[PDB]
Design a protein around this ligand. Structure first.
Ligand code: HEM
Length: 153
């Protein structure tokens, strides 16, 4: 359970992310695809993009990044009261997209890395630690849902 102070730090850096949701979404997905190339193989509409510039020029990819961050922002804003928001995401990611928890750890790392690259002054150890706790909590919840649905990825 995050503290109120921890949530405030998370929401404070998240407000900076919201000044350019598209750019942050691009960078996060690009980082994910570059740090962990097998993850690209789960996106059949992007798996042909080969260079960082091609990835940045993809409007489809850019739109998807906004969709991802928008869902995640909505969950973060619930400050731990997120079952109704998170459960549909768990269901699709288990049933349709087939995304193992280890890939959720990869994109969590990509989030941290981007927020730290763009907002160092608002993403010190304190805020990093809070955001890591939030994402950890979502990964724990998603996993219980995955199992309820019979998905052992
Ligand atoms: C913070 C973590 C994540 C969030 C918040 C998130 C959110 C979303 C959302 C909202 C959608 C559109 C609705 C849906 O299909 O459920 C989506 C689609 C998708 N997600 Fe995720 N996702 C996350 C992590 C992952 C990861 C790690 C992968 C793959 C490694 C993945 C693969 C996909 C795929 C393939 C789609 C469908 C893409 C499309 O064809 O438009 N997601 N995701």
């Amino acid at each position: 359970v995050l503290s109120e102070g921890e949530w405030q730090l998370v929401l404070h850096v998240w407000a900076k992310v919201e000044a350019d949701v598209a750019g942050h979404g691009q960078d996060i997905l690009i980082r994910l695809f570059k740090s962990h190339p097998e993850t690209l193989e789960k996106f059949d509409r992007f798996k042909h993009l080969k260079t960082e510039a091609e990835m940045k020029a993809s409007e489809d990819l850019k739109k998807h990044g906004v969709t991802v961050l928008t869902a995640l922002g909505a969950i973060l804003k619930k400050k731990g009261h997120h079952e109704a928001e998170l459960k549909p995401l768990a269901q699709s990611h288990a049933t349709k997209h087939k995304i193992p928890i280890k890939y959720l750890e990869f994109i969590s790392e990509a989030i941290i890395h981007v927020l730290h690259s763009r907002h160092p002054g608002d993403f010190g150890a304190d805020a990093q630690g809070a955001m890591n706790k939030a994402l950890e909590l979502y990964r724990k919840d998603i996993a219980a849902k995955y199992k309820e649905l019979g998905y052992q990825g």
